[PDB]
């Protein structure tokens, strides 16, 4: 669960980009194309996304790299 989000802010700065990155990741995990990188503890996708932000396994560049890898995989699997 969450009480304060200060660790996520000091990981991803500006306090407004954090909301966007966390919403992007939470939407990735919600419409279930993906599964969390962190052990979920009944946390919703918002809290799981923030916990992934805190530990540094998810940020904007990580999401962009994974998205580009997915786009390359789809093209290479088009046949």
């Amino acid at each position: 669960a969450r009480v304060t989000v200060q660790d996520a802010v000091e990981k991803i700065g500006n306090r407004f980009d954090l909301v966007l990155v966390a919403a992007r990741r939470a939407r990735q995990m919600q419409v279930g194309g993906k599964d969390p990188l962190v052990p979920e503890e009944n946390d919703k996708t918002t809290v799981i996304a923030l916990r992934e932000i805190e530990e540094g396994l998810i940020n904007n560049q990580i999401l962009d790299v994974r998205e580009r890898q997915e786009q390359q995989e789809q093209e290479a699997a088009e046949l």
Binding site: R15, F16, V19, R27, Q30, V31
Partner: protein
Amino acid sequence: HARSTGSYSLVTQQPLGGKAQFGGQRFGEMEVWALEAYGAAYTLQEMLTVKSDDVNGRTKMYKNIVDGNHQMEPGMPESFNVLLKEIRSLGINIELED
């Protein structure tokens, strides 16, 4: 009192007054200033488009919520269209351009 979805008004398709006709809470101008003083741009946008006035967006949002997807497709409020028609029914020609 509590409301999620009920009856909407006639000219401006907005919820009605409190607890006699199952009406919503007024999110007035000072609350809009309070949400602008934070950075809550998405909360404000769902306050003034999907929760209140956009006719297609509120049905889409209800279907999304009951389908387990929390995503908004905002559109443009009906009150702005009413305002455009009322200004345009004077001699003045106001229009949206791109």
